[PDB]
Ligand binder design. Structure first.
Ligand SMILES: *C(=O)CC[C@H](NC(=O)CC[C@H](NC(=O)CCCCCCCCCCCCCCC)C(=O)O)C(=O)O
Length: 29
């Protein structure tokens, strides 16, 4: 895999889009 959770920027586009709370994405769900 390549979650790209990181390079999701140089690959998809922007990363800080979720600001950073993304960490909660797979935690508070
Ligand atoms: C902008 O939104 C880009 C287009 C679109 N974006 C999204 O889907 C939003 C996030 C984006 N895509 C992902 O969700 C893909 C991430 C991989 C799936 C998650 C697996 C679990 C992650 C576990 C993290 C463990 C930490 C390891 C250390 C790095 C993105 O990835 O940013 C898009 O096309 O996806």
């Amino acid at each position: 895999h390549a979650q790209g959770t990181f390079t999701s920027d140089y690959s998809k586009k922007l990363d800080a889009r979720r600001a950073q709370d993304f960490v909660q994405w797979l935690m508070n769900t």
